[PDB]
Amino acid sequence: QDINDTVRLLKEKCLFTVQQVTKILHSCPSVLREDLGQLEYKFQYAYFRMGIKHPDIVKSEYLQYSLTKIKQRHIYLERLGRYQTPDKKGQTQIPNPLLKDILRVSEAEFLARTACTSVEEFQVFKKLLAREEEESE
Amino acid sequence: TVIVERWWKVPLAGEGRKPRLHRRHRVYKLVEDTKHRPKENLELILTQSVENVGVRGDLVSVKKSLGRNRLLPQGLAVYASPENKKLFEEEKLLR
Amino acid sequence: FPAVRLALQNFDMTYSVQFGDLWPSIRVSLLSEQKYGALVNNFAAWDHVSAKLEQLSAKDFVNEAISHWENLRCFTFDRGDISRFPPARPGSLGVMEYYLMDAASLLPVLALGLQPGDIVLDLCAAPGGKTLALLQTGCCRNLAANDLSPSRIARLQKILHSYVPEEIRDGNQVRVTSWDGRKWGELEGDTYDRVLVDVPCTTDRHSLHEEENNIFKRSRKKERQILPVLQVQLLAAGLLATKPGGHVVYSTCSLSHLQNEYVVQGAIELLANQYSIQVQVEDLTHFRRVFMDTFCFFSSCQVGELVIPNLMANFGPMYFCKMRRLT
Amino acid sequence: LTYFSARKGKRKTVKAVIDRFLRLHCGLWVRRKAGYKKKLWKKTPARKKRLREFVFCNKTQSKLLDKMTTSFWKRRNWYVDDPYQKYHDRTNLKV
Amino acid sequence: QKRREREQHIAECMAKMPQMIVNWQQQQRENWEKAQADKER
Amino acid sequence: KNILVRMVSEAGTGFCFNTKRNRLREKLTLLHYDPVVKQRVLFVEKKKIRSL
RNA sequence: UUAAUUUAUUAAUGCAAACAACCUGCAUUAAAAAUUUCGGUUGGGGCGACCUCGGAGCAGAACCCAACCUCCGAGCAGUACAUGCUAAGACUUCACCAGUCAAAGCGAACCUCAAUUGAUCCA
RNA sequence: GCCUGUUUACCAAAAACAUCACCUCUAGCAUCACCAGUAUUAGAGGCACCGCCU
RNA sequence: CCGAGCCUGGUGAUAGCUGGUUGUCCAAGAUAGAAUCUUAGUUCAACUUUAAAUUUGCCCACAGAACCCAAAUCCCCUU
Ligand SMILES: Nc1nc2c(ncn2[C@@H]2O[C@H](COP(=O)(O)OP(=O)(O)OP(=O)(O)O)[C@@H](O)[C@H]2O)c(=O)[nH]1
Ligand SMILES: [Mg+2]
Ligand SMILES: [Mg+2]
Ligand SMILES: [Mg+2]
Ligand SMILES: [Mg+2]
Ligand SMILES: [Mg+2]
Ligand SMILES: [Mg+2]
Ligand SMILES: [Mg+2]
Ligand SMILES: [Mg+2]
Ligand SMILES: [Mg+2]
Ligand SMILES: [Mg+2]
Ligand SMILES: [Mg+2]
């Protein structure tokens, strides 16, 4: 039942094709351990707020990473102005950085190549975002 | 069994008359479903030795499933009726 | 259609050009939480409240500034610390122990540097904060706090009731008015030794956070567009009011070069031409160096000083320019 | 209201009137003041005293209530210790 | 029984009441004195 | 802001009355007239009724 | 349809029931649908603004009346804890609802000012 | 608009609908459709033949 | 005569909307507002009608009704 409901969340509530779901299971087995609800939130974070479509979500192992890291890095870039959610037409003023350039790269590489900010500022932002999440919950 | 109860009270009909029901008197709420009640036990008097319950002529509280599926159908037990209890009492006192 | 998003669009398209590579940091700081300072109520048990704050591990940035400068006490956390001050509560003397206000908002008053016994004007500053700091300072020769909004006047009155003792407020030491600053030049001229002109502005942070009454909403487009003219008029009125040789400080809660440096320069030009009064802009570079350890300043500023909001110190934005009326 | 009921053909009583108003047999209708139980913390003592009072109704209001209630509510009631027994009749009334 | 319980409880509270009122007023006065002492510094 | 609180008679009677006090201010103890006892008695704040 | 209210119906699962499945009951999640609605002013359209209360233009002088409009404000705060109880007689926003003032008396001592608000039912 | 065809019987015959071709999604399977079929299959749908560059 | 066929029935559906609402004669008989998913409606008020009880009703002489800084109105003994 756990496996079936994970697959059903990936298919019906995330609209991943059967082949896409098989590839997701192959590349990110931790999704199975990950609880429902959290997985849907991660996927919708990628889809709506980050404007990442299913082929890219599957090609780049986005579901492998943790929601905390994803939100930290993405919101940092968004508030810095580097990232921008696509509009209704799916267009952005500046091309968005690649998911590999955001999540796959190490913290230092992400802060230097993409964010171009200081580790101290990143730590301050991480603490602030954690506090904001706690208050929201 | 499902036990239901009217949402709307039915006006008293009288002594010899029958209550007159309307559309709203057909609305019910489930007060209890008997199948979800805690299981009870069936009293039986054994007629033949059976493992882990008894030997013969001893009142036993057995799970209703066991009583109705194995013991009674196979004759290993009989209902704990007053007549059966009396008969096995005479059996015991004669033995 | 979020007026917050409208404000973000405008701030991007303008401040990105204005600041180049600093705009991302300023943007993230503005969109992040605001760092607050605790101004201890001098009227209340100032020493006890200061001790309690120091136990809470804050430090008096004003005190450390005066340390190397060669009467105010506001405690702030160390650089990078996001700790929040506990909510202020009434003290033994019946007045609130401390006020939770932006630390950068205190710099205008500190630069104004109220001499013992100076007559003071607050042309339009009625959000609290700077006004309470002035009261806690030694402006015993009376302070005239004027605003055009009765709601903000009522808020100022409530904060004065909570903080400033009625014994201090009873006399003409405090005069709160609900009039227009532009008329103030005619109402009084060459009267105040010290003037603080906190004109209405874009209030970048509040515009970005609060949706309600956002200056960048479409319905208020006319007011947003005419803001520079109104600010110039208010600063001119304050300069007219200030005594010859008197000091004024023009303050703005925005990053806009247009609303800060062009405003001050246009005020100087208009005053020198229409009213034939010369004003000299004082040098606040020493102020910048003294307060640099706590606030990050925009080094590339012509007239005045600009505290920019950084993540390590989310105290901005705050532009303040000191001007002495030579004539 | 229902001028002719479908089961008896009688005129019905609006029970919302009965739940809210008292009829004195003399023909007066008594009522409580609206909001007498609301937000008393922001009402002055005089206002609260005014609200806590039992108040008579207009002529037109009384006529409306009489129409909305049936004759059973307009009878003499000799209750044991009715607080309104004295008020049930008028005295020294000229026209 | 309930009536006498109420009466005796009220009696005990009233017996304590004058001393409690005196203590409360003394506490208010001493708080005011402490405030004045702090003002004196 | 201010909060509405239920001051309860300390005379043992069930008498109560609602007052307003600043949320940040300390709990309230107050002399008030007690109609049941027919005398001024202390009242102590029991619970916050609502926030206003 | 990301309007409101539902899951009656199907499909799943979970827990009971009964001896894995089927069936039944209760839940949860979806699909499918079902019933109903779509306030007012502002020539239409977009974006807006406004809907209750107070003050001015504003009735030149008892009262009431200039809607639409030009505007300026309020959705409190402060004090006090007799800001307790009662009661003649009056005012009243043109109805009602509601809202005001108040002698005397009991009991004590020897509110403030423009608006600062909300009925019934029901909790 | 690829084409032949279809459509608002009774005001629109068309650039609309369909269409070979191509593309996407779903399904590993029997006794009433699909189918007496089985992934080169079947269903749902997009677009419009073919042909080219990237 | 299909954005949901036709017939029967619920059904005399409902309609704040349109239309109509039939002998004679006499009499009294006209614009104040308030609330309202309310401005095509209704409830209250005002006005109108009838009957009854009682006594004052209208017109109006002085006198009187604010400071801020015109016309008149109200009140009102007589008549
Ligand atoms: N007096 C009063 N009644 C209220 C209040 N809130 C709700 N009610 C009652 O409940 C009705 C409104 O119901 P809802 O709108 O569902 O109330 P809610 O509190 O938002 O939500 P529920 O608790 O789910 O009903 C009112 O007409 C009253 O009967 C309130 O603040 N005051
Ligand atoms: Mg009978
Ligand atoms: Mg009236
Ligand atoms: Mg063709
Ligand atoms: Mg053809
Ligand atoms: Mg055909
Ligand atoms: Mg045709
Ligand atoms: Mg044709
Ligand atoms: Mg037909
Ligand atoms: Mg009809
Ligand atoms: Mg006539
Ligand atoms: Mg209508």
Side-chain angles (χ1 to χ4, degrees), chain C residues 269-292:
Chain C
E269 173 269 342
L270 181 66
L271 186 67
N273 301 354
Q274 184 180 357
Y275 310 101
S276 193
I277 297 168
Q278 179 212 11
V279 178
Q280 187 274 329
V281 164
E282 296 293 329
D283 185 46
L284 295 171
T285 313
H286 179 67
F287 198 87
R288 177 179 289 174
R289 277 85 59 84
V290 161
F291 286 88
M292 186 180 289

PDB file of all heavy atoms in Angstrom, chain C residues 269-292:
ATOM      1  N   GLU C 269      18.371  74.782  -3.812  1.00  0.00           N
ATOM      2  CA  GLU C 269      18.280  75.721  -4.926  1.00  0.00           C
ATOM      3  C   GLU C 269      17.042  76.603  -4.801  1.00  0.00           C
ATOM      4  O   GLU C 269      17.113  77.826  -4.977  1.00  0.00           O
ATOM      5  CB  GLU C 269      18.267  74.956  -6.250  1.00  0.00           C
ATOM      6  CG  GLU C 269      18.007  75.827  -7.473  1.00  0.00           C
ATOM      7  CD  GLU C 269      16.532  75.938  -7.822  1.00  0.00           C
ATOM      8  OE1 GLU C 269      15.737  75.094  -7.359  1.00  0.00           O
ATOM      9  OE2 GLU C 269      16.168  76.876  -8.564  1.00  0.00           O
ATOM     10  N   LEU C 270      15.893  75.995  -4.499  1.00  0.00           N
ATOM     11  CA  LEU C 270      14.658  76.760  -4.379  1.00  0.00           C
ATOM     12  C   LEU C 270      14.750  77.769  -3.245  1.00  0.00           C
ATOM     13  O   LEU C 270      14.315  78.916  -3.388  1.00  0.00           O
ATOM     14  CB  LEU C 270      13.478  75.814  -4.161  1.00  0.00           C
ATOM     15  CG  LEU C 270      12.098  76.464  -4.042  1.00  0.00           C
ATOM     16  CD1 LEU C 270      11.692  77.107  -5.357  1.00  0.00           C
ATOM     17  CD2 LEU C 270      11.064  75.439  -3.605  1.00  0.00           C
ATOM     18  N   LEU C 271      15.311  77.361  -2.106  1.00  0.00           N
ATOM     19  CA  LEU C 271      15.453  78.287  -0.990  1.00  0.00           C
ATOM     20  C   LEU C 271      16.404  79.426  -1.337  1.00  0.00           C
ATOM     21  O   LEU C 271      16.143  80.585  -0.994  1.00  0.00           O
ATOM     22  CB  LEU C 271      15.942  77.534   0.243  1.00  0.00           C
ATOM     23  CG  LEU C 271      16.006  78.350   1.531  1.00  0.00           C
ATOM     24  CD1 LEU C 271      14.616  78.756   1.998  1.00  0.00           C
ATOM     25  CD2 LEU C 271      16.730  77.566   2.600  1.00  0.00           C
ATOM     26  N   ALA C 272      17.510  79.118  -2.017  1.00  0.00           N
ATOM     27  CA  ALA C 272      18.497  80.145  -2.328  1.00  0.00           C
ATOM     28  C   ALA C 272      17.998  81.107  -3.396  1.00  0.00           C
ATOM     29  O   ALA C 272      18.456  82.254  -3.453  1.00  0.00           O
ATOM     30  CB  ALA C 272      19.805  79.494  -2.778  1.00  0.00           C
ATOM     31  N   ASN C 273      17.080  80.667  -4.256  1.00  0.00           N
ATOM     32  CA  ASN C 273      16.581  81.535  -5.318  1.00  0.00           C
ATOM     33  C   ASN C 273      15.314  82.278  -4.899  1.00  0.00           C
ATOM     34  O   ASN C 273      15.293  83.512  -4.868  1.00  0.00           O
ATOM     35  CB  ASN C 273      16.327  80.712  -6.586  1.00  0.00           C
ATOM     36  CG  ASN C 273      17.578  80.021  -7.090  1.00  0.00           C
ATOM     37  OD1 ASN C 273      18.672  80.235  -6.566  1.00  0.00           O
ATOM     38  ND2 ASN C 273      17.424  79.189  -8.113  1.00  0.00           N
ATOM     39  N   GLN C 274      14.253  81.541  -4.570  1.00  0.00           N
ATOM     40  CA  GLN C 274      12.975  82.176  -4.262  1.00  0.00           C
ATOM     41  C   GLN C 274      13.064  83.021  -2.996  1.00  0.00           C
ATOM     42  O   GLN C 274      12.580  84.158  -2.963  1.00  0.00           O
ATOM     43  CB  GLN C 274      11.887  81.112  -4.123  1.00  0.00           C
ATOM     44  CG  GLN C 274      10.492  81.675  -3.907  1.00  0.00           C
ATOM     45  CD  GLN C 274       9.442  80.592  -3.774  1.00  0.00           C
ATOM     46  OE1 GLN C 274       9.741  79.404  -3.892  1.00  0.00           O
ATOM     47  NE2 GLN C 274       8.202  80.996  -3.524  1.00  0.00           N
ATOM     48  N   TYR C 275      13.676  82.482  -1.942  1.00  0.00           N
ATOM     49  CA  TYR C 275      13.746  83.159  -0.654  1.00  0.00           C
ATOM     50  C   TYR C 275      15.121  83.736  -0.348  1.00  0.00           C
ATOM     51  O   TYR C 275      15.284  84.392   0.686  1.00  0.00           O
ATOM     52  CB  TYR C 275      13.330  82.197   0.465  1.00  0.00           C
ATOM     53  CG  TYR C 275      12.018  81.496   0.199  1.00  0.00           C
ATOM     54  CD1 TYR C 275      11.986  80.188  -0.258  1.00  0.00           C
ATOM     55  CD2 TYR C 275      10.809  82.148   0.403  1.00  0.00           C
ATOM     56  CE1 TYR C 275      10.787  79.546  -0.504  1.00  0.00           C
ATOM     57  CE2 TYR C 275       9.606  81.516   0.160  1.00  0.00           C
ATOM     58  CZ  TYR C 275       9.600  80.216  -0.293  1.00  0.00           C
ATOM     59  OH  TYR C 275       8.403  79.582  -0.536  1.00  0.00           O
ATOM     60  N   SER C 276      16.110  83.515  -1.212  1.00  0.00           N
ATOM     61  CA  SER C 276      17.433  84.118  -1.058  1.00  0.00           C
ATOM     62  C   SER C 276      18.034  83.799   0.311  1.00  0.00           C
ATOM     63  O   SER C 276      18.459  84.689   1.053  1.00  0.00           O
ATOM     64  CB  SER C 276      17.367  85.630  -1.284  1.00  0.00           C
ATOM     65  OG  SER C 276      18.664  86.182  -1.423  1.00  0.00           O
ATOM     66  N   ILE C 277      18.068  82.512   0.645  1.00  0.00           N
ATOM     67  CA  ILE C 277      18.680  82.030   1.878  1.00  0.00           C
ATOM     68  C   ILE C 277      19.657  80.920   1.519  1.00  0.00           C
ATOM     69  O   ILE C 277      19.290  79.963   0.829  1.00  0.00           O
ATOM     70  CB  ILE C 277      17.627  81.526   2.884  1.00  0.00           C
ATOM     71  CG1 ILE C 277      16.707  82.673   3.308  1.00  0.00           C
ATOM     72  CG2 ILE C 277      18.303  80.912   4.104  1.00  0.00           C
ATOM     73  CD1 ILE C 277      15.476  82.225   4.068  1.00  0.00           C
ATOM     74  N   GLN C 278      20.895  81.051   1.984  1.00  0.00           N
ATOM     75  CA  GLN C 278      21.942  80.082   1.692  1.00  0.00           C
ATOM     76  C   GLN C 278      21.984  79.007   2.771  1.00  0.00           C
ATOM     77  O   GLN C 278      21.858  79.299   3.964  1.00  0.00           O
ATOM     78  CB  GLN C 278      23.300  80.782   1.595  1.00  0.00           C
ATOM     79  CG  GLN C 278      24.483  79.856   1.318  1.00  0.00           C
ATOM     80  CD  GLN C 278      25.773  80.344   1.950  1.00  0.00           C
ATOM     81  OE1 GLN C 278      25.771  81.264   2.766  1.00  0.00           O
ATOM     82  NE2 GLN C 278      26.885  79.723   1.574  1.00  0.00           N
ATOM     83  N   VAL C 279      22.162  77.760   2.340  1.00  0.00           N
ATOM     84  CA  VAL C 279      22.274  76.613   3.234  1.00  0.00           C
ATOM     85  C   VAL C 279      23.485  75.796   2.810  1.00  0.00           C
ATOM     86  O   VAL C 279      23.681  75.544   1.616  1.00  0.00           O
ATOM     87  CB  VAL C 279      21.003  75.742   3.210  1.00  0.00           C
ATOM     88  CG1 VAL C 279      21.174  74.529   4.109  1.00  0.00           C
ATOM     89  CG2 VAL C 279      19.800  76.557   3.641  1.00  0.00           C
ATOM     90  N   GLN C 280      24.293  75.382   3.782  1.00  0.00           N
ATOM     91  CA  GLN C 280      25.494  74.596   3.534  1.00  0.00           C
ATOM     92  C   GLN C 280      25.297  73.191   4.084  1.00  0.00           C
ATOM     93  O   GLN C 280      24.919  73.023   5.247  1.00  0.00           O
ATOM     94  CB  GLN C 280      26.718  75.254   4.175  1.00  0.00           C
ATOM     95  CG  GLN C 280      28.039  74.585   3.826  1.00  0.00           C
ATOM     96  CD  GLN C 280      28.373  73.428   4.748  1.00  0.00           C
ATOM     97  OE1 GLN C 280      28.001  73.424   5.920  1.00  0.00           O
ATOM     98  NE2 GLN C 280      29.080  72.437   4.218  1.00  0.00           N
ATOM     99  N   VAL C 281      25.557  72.190   3.250  1.00  0.00           N
ATOM    100  CA  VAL C 281      25.398  70.797   3.655  1.00  0.00           C
ATOM    101  C   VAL C 281      26.598  70.396   4.504  1.00  0.00           C
ATOM    102  O   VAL C 281      27.746  70.499   4.064  1.00  0.00           O
ATOM    103  CB  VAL C 281      25.254  69.880   2.433  1.00  0.00           C
ATOM    104  CG1 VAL C 281      25.482  68.427   2.825  1.00  0.00           C
ATOM    105  CG2 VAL C 281      23.885  70.059   1.797  1.00  0.00           C
ATOM    106  N   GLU C 282      26.331  69.939   5.724  1.00  0.00           N
ATOM    107  CA  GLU C 282      27.395  69.517   6.619  1.00  0.00           C
ATOM    108  C   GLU C 282      27.986  68.191   6.151  1.00  0.00           C
ATOM    109  O   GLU C 282      27.369  67.431   5.399  1.00  0.00           O
ATOM    110  CB  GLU C 282      26.868  69.380   8.047  1.00  0.00           C
ATOM    111  CG  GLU C 282      26.376  70.682   8.662  1.00  0.00           C
ATOM    112  CD  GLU C 282      27.491  71.683   8.887  1.00  0.00           C
ATOM    113  OE1 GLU C 282      28.635  71.253   9.148  1.00  0.00           O
ATOM    114  OE2 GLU C 282      27.224  72.901   8.806  1.00  0.00           O
ATOM    115  N   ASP C 283      29.205  67.917   6.609  1.00  0.00           N
ATOM    116  CA  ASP C 283      29.906  66.688   6.260  1.00  0.00           C
ATOM    117  C   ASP C 283      29.625  65.629   7.319  1.00  0.00           C
ATOM    118  O   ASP C 283      29.983  65.803   8.489  1.00  0.00           O
ATOM    119  CB  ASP C 283      31.407  66.939   6.139  1.00  0.00           C
ATOM    120  CG  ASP C 283      32.164  65.714   5.669  1.00  0.00           C
ATOM    121  OD1 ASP C 283      31.705  65.063   4.708  1.00  0.00           O
ATOM    122  OD2 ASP C 283      33.217  65.399   6.264  1.00  0.00           O
ATOM    123  N   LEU C 284      28.987  64.535   6.906  1.00  0.00           N
ATOM    124  CA  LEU C 284      28.669  63.424   7.790  1.00  0.00           C
ATOM    125  C   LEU C 284      29.581  62.224   7.561  1.00  0.00           C
ATOM    126  O   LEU C 284      29.228  61.103   7.941  1.00  0.00           O
ATOM    127  CB  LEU C 284      27.206  63.015   7.613  1.00  0.00           C
ATOM    128  CG  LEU C 284      26.163  64.056   8.022  1.00  0.00           C
ATOM    129  CD1 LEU C 284      24.774  63.620   7.583  1.00  0.00           C
ATOM    130  CD2 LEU C 284      26.198  64.298   9.521  1.00  0.00           C
ATOM    131  N   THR C 285      30.740  62.434   6.935  1.00  0.00           N
ATOM    132  CA  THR C 285      31.653  61.324   6.681  1.00  0.00           C
ATOM    133  C   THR C 285      32.189  60.746   7.986  1.00  0.00           C
ATOM    134  O   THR C 285      32.334  59.524   8.121  1.00  0.00           O
ATOM    135  CB  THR C 285      32.798  61.790   5.782  1.00  0.00           C
ATOM    136  OG1 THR C 285      32.266  62.524   4.672  1.00  0.00           O
ATOM    137  CG2 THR C 285      33.576  60.602   5.245  1.00  0.00           C
ATOM    138  N   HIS C 286      32.498  61.609   8.958  1.00  0.00           N
ATOM    139  CA  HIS C 286      32.906  61.118  10.269  1.00  0.00           C
ATOM    140  C   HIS C 286      31.790  60.311  10.915  1.00  0.00           C
ATOM    141  O   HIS C 286      32.043  59.282  11.551  1.00  0.00           O
ATOM    142  CB  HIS C 286      33.314  62.287  11.165  1.00  0.00           C
ATOM    143  CG  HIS C 286      33.729  61.875  12.543  1.00  0.00           C
ATOM    144  ND1 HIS C 286      34.870  61.143  12.789  1.00  0.00           N
ATOM    145  CD2 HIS C 286      33.157  62.097  13.751  1.00  0.00           C
ATOM    146  CE1 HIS C 286      34.983  60.928  14.087  1.00  0.00           C
ATOM    147  NE2 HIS C 286      33.956  61.497  14.693  1.00  0.00           N
ATOM    148  N   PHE C 287      30.545  60.764  10.758  1.00  0.00           N
ATOM    149  CA  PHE C 287      29.403  60.000  11.246  1.00  0.00           C
ATOM    150  C   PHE C 287      29.358  58.621  10.598  1.00  0.00           C
ATOM    151  O   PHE C 287      29.141  57.608  11.277  1.00  0.00           O
ATOM    152  CB  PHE C 287      28.119  60.779  10.956  1.00  0.00           C
ATOM    153  CG  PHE C 287      26.930  60.330  11.753  1.00  0.00           C
ATOM    154  CD1 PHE C 287      26.682  60.862  13.007  1.00  0.00           C
ATOM    155  CD2 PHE C 287      26.048  59.395  11.242  1.00  0.00           C
ATOM    156  CE1 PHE C 287      25.584  60.461  13.741  1.00  0.00           C
ATOM    157  CE2 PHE C 287      24.948  58.988  11.972  1.00  0.00           C
ATOM    158  CZ  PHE C 287      24.717  59.522  13.223  1.00  0.00           C
ATOM    159  N   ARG C 288      29.567  58.567   9.280  1.00  0.00           N
ATOM    160  CA  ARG C 288      29.577  57.290   8.574  1.00  0.00           C
ATOM    161  C   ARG C 288      30.644  56.364   9.137  1.00  0.00           C
ATOM    162  O   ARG C 288      30.373  55.195   9.431  1.00  0.00           O
ATOM    163  CB  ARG C 288      29.812  57.515   7.078  1.00  0.00           C
ATOM    164  CG  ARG C 288      29.902  56.221   6.274  1.00  0.00           C
ATOM    165  CD  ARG C 288      30.119  56.472   4.791  1.00  0.00           C
ATOM    166  NE  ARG C 288      28.937  57.017   4.135  1.00  0.00           N
ATOM    167  CZ  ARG C 288      28.903  57.429   2.876  1.00  0.00           C
ATOM    168  NH1 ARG C 288      29.974  57.374   2.100  1.00  0.00           N
ATOM    169  NH2 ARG C 288      27.765  57.908   2.381  1.00  0.00           N
ATOM    170  N   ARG C 289      31.871  56.863   9.285  1.00  0.00           N
ATOM    171  CA  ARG C 289      32.938  56.009   9.801  1.00  0.00           C
ATOM    172  C   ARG C 289      32.637  55.548  11.220  1.00  0.00           C
ATOM    173  O   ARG C 289      32.888  54.388  11.569  1.00  0.00           O
ATOM    174  CB  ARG C 289      34.284  56.732   9.752  1.00  0.00           C
ATOM    175  CG  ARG C 289      34.979  56.669   8.397  1.00  0.00           C
ATOM    176  CD  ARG C 289      34.503  57.761   7.465  1.00  0.00           C
ATOM    177  NE  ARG C 289      34.733  59.084   8.033  1.00  0.00           N
ATOM    178  CZ  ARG C 289      35.877  59.749   7.948  1.00  0.00           C
ATOM    179  NH1 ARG C 289      36.930  59.242   7.326  1.00  0.00           N
ATOM    180  NH2 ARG C 289      35.969  60.954   8.503  1.00  0.00           N
ATOM    181  N   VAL C 290      32.099  56.439  12.054  1.00  0.00           N
ATOM    182  CA  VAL C 290      31.835  56.084  13.444  1.00  0.00           C
ATOM    183  C   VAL C 290      30.782  54.987  13.527  1.00  0.00           C
ATOM    184  O   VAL C 290      30.920  54.033  14.301  1.00  0.00           O
ATOM    185  CB  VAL C 290      31.419  57.335  14.240  1.00  0.00           C
ATOM    186  CG1 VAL C 290      30.715  56.942  15.528  1.00  0.00           C
ATOM    187  CG2 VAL C 290      32.635  58.198  14.537  1.00  0.00           C
ATOM    188  N   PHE C 291      29.717  55.098  12.734  1.00  0.00           N
ATOM    189  CA  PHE C 291      28.616  54.145  12.796  1.00  0.00           C
ATOM    190  C   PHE C 291      28.740  53.018  11.776  1.00  0.00           C
ATOM    191  O   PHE C 291      27.795  52.240  11.613  1.00  0.00           O
ATOM    192  CB  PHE C 291      27.283  54.873  12.607  1.00  0.00           C
ATOM    193  CG  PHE C 291      26.865  55.677  13.802  1.00  0.00           C
ATOM    194  CD1 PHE C 291      27.279  56.987  13.952  1.00  0.00           C
ATOM    195  CD2 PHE C 291      26.063  55.116  14.782  1.00  0.00           C
ATOM    196  CE1 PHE C 291      26.899  57.726  15.054  1.00  0.00           C
ATOM    197  CE2 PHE C 291      25.679  55.852  15.885  1.00  0.00           C
ATOM    198  CZ  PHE C 291      26.098  57.158  16.021  1.00  0.00           C
ATOM    199  N   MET C 292      29.880  52.911  11.093  1.00  0.00           N
ATOM    200  CA  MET C 292      30.043  51.874  10.079  1.00  0.00           C
ATOM    201  C   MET C 292      30.015  50.482  10.696  1.00  0.00           C
ATOM    202  O   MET C 292      29.480  49.543  10.095  1.00  0.00           O
ATOM    203  CB  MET C 292      31.350  52.096   9.320  1.00  0.00           C
ATOM    204  CG  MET C 292      31.556  51.157   8.145  1.00  0.00           C
ATOM    205  SD  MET C 292      33.109  51.468   7.288  1.00  0.00           S
ATOM    206  CE  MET C 292      32.746  53.031   6.492  1.00  0.00           C
TER     207      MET C 292
END
